[PDB]
Enzyme design. Structure first.
Site, PDB file in Angstrom:
ATOM      1  N   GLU A  11       0.419  -1.139  -0.007  1.00  0.00           N
ATOM      2  CA  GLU A  11      -0.080  -0.347   0.038  1.00  0.00           C
ATOM      3  C   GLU A  11       0.703   1.508  -0.129  1.00  0.00           C
ATOM      4  O   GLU A  11      -0.163   2.161  -0.237  1.00  0.00           O
ATOM      5  CB  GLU A  11      -0.587   0.144   1.224  1.00  0.00           C
ATOM      6  CG  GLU A  11      -1.807  -1.040   1.154  1.00  0.00           C
ATOM      7  CD  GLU A  11      -2.852  -0.741   0.465  1.00  0.00           C
ATOM      8  OE1 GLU A  11      -3.703  -1.672   0.175  1.00  0.00           O
ATOM      9  OE2 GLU A  11      -2.618   0.335  -0.068  1.00  0.00           O
ATOM     10  N   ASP A  20      -7.033   6.903  -4.731  1.00  0.00           N
ATOM     11  CA  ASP A  20      -6.132   5.068  -5.459  1.00  0.00           C
ATOM     12  C   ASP A  20      -6.691   4.647  -6.680  1.00  0.00           C
ATOM     13  O   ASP A  20      -6.977   5.620  -7.387  1.00  0.00           O
ATOM     14  CB  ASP A  20      -6.679   4.270  -3.904  1.00  0.00           C
ATOM     15  CG  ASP A  20      -8.764   3.581  -4.312  1.00  0.00           C
ATOM     16  OD1 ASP A  20      -8.568   2.762  -3.187  1.00  0.00           O
ATOM     17  OD2 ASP A  20      -8.701   4.434  -5.379  1.00  0.00           O
TER      18      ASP A  20
END
Ligand SMILES: [Cl-]
Ligand SMILES: [Cl-]
EC number: 3.2.1.17
Length: 162
Positions: A11, A20
């Protein structure tokens, strides 16, 4: 290596709101804020999550704290799920970590739909599962991360992460 380090790698860590891979508002260590397009809605969700007026920025500590909550929630999601628990219960430590990753990225419900791969994992048919897991949008959209997790299910080791 452990689940923390492993996701920390998948991440990344960002202290400003960001979009994202799907274009959603996120912050910290893969913490999804909202699926709304509104940057305000995201800011709102963020101050609510942090307990203070953030103005789209947070500290490392804050980030880390959302990150613990998030892993916790994922695990518990898994244990509460009739389709996941067993799978999880059947596996060793490394592979368990792999499952949680998937769950953190994609939700319990998203993961609960890989029926067939789940059946395989459960049966310990490693190579087959790994093939089946690849026939997924998931693999096609985030292929390098997906290869990492996959290999992890295949080998029961952390090699993909070293
Ligand atoms: Cl929260
Ligand atoms: Cl990727």
């Amino acid at each position: 290596m452990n689940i923390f380090e492993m996701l920390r790698i998948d991440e990344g860590l960002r202290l400003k709101i960001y979009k994202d891979t799907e274009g959603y508002y996120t912050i910290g260590i893969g913490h999804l804020l909202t699926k709304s397009p509104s940057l305000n809605a995201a800011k709102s969700e963020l101050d609510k999550a942090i307990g203070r007026n953030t103005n789209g920025v947070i500290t490392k500590d804050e980030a880390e704290k959302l990150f613990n909550q998030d892993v916790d929630a994922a695990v518990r999601g898994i244990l509460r799920n009739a389709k996941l628990k067993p799978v999880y219960d059947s596996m060793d430590a490394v592979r368990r970590a792999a499952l949680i990753n998937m769950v953190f990225q994609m939700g319990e419900t998203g993961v609960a739909g890989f029926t067939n791969s789940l059946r395989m994992l459960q049966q310990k048919r490693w190579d087959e599962a790994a093939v089946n897991l690849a026939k997924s949008r998931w693999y096609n959209q985030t292929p390098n991360r997906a290869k990492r997790v996959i290999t992890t299910f295949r080998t029961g080791t952390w090699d993909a992460y070293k």
